[PDB]
Curated annotation (Swiss-Prot), chain A:
It comes from the Eukaryota. Changing residue 81 to Q: In AMYLD1; amyloid polyneuropathy and cardiomyopathy. The chain holds residues 29 to 145 of 147 of the full protein. Its main location: secreted. This is Transthyretin. Changing residue 76 to N: In AMYLD1; vitrous amyloid. Changing residue 20 to M: In AMYLD1; amyloid polyneuropathy.
Amino acid sequence: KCPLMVKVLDAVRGSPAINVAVHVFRKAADDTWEPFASGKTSESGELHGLTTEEEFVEGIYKVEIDTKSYWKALGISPFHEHAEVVFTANDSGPRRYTIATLLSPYSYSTTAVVTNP
Amino acid sequence: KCPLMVKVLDAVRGSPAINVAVHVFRKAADDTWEPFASGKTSESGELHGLTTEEEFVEGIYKVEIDTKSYWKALGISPFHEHAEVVFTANDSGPRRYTIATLLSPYSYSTTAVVTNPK
Ligand SMILES: N[C@@H](Cc1cc(I)c(Oc2cc(I)c(O)c(I)c2)c(I)c1)C(=O)O
Ligand SMILES: N[C@@H](Cc1cc(I)c(Oc2cc(I)c(O)c(I)c2)c(I)c1)C(=O)O
């Protein structure tokens, strides 16, 4: 059981975006962002096992993807410092969240797939 | 003569996203986000006149678009709290920046168009 999954693709090369740093944060009571989990995407551009059902309670989360580092390593000058995804996790809706982001030097697209499957 | 322009479109209705709130921040000397400019998109889904060439110095800027309020006003409970765009501006001299964002309830796409003053 994996409640939160992250997927990153490269629109320049038509490949998974590998070894991309991802930091997850949870909004705290003082309105500040508290480190929650982190990792680097795998050979398939994915990051799993960030959290468990027990720890993933309702609240506001921020997913930060270090896109600038990724492009620099390819020798490409990017526009964005990073890509950020801020959302509320609600117990009402589906239980699994997939955050998928597509990267270009000057653009990114992000989508969420929320399922019970 | 307008160094920072914001354009927002609606992918569900195929139209400009009107009355969208936009807040711009600049990273301060102490690593905090200081208020820089704000406005609402017009009928054309555009926001102009946020700043001048003079005030828009080199720095790290954050454009925050209030997408949650936009969707809620339409009857939709969207996924994201807001759309945020963070970038370094003018570090090799003055440029003109257009930040364009396309909205759907569970997805958004953002692109930048950067040009060298005419
Ligand atoms: N191995 C993982 C990888 C994976 C997940 C998704 I979700 C996906 O689908 C999209 C579609 C679009 I359009 C995007 O911009 C993006 I990013 C992802 C793709 I490709 C691959 C898995 O299959 O388990
Ligand atoms: N008057 C301003 C307004 C304007 C800018 C852009 I840039 C643009 O083009 C796109 C293309 C895609 I694809 C998008 O998802 C989005 I949002 C905008 C359009 I139409 C209009 C100008 O022309 O200066």
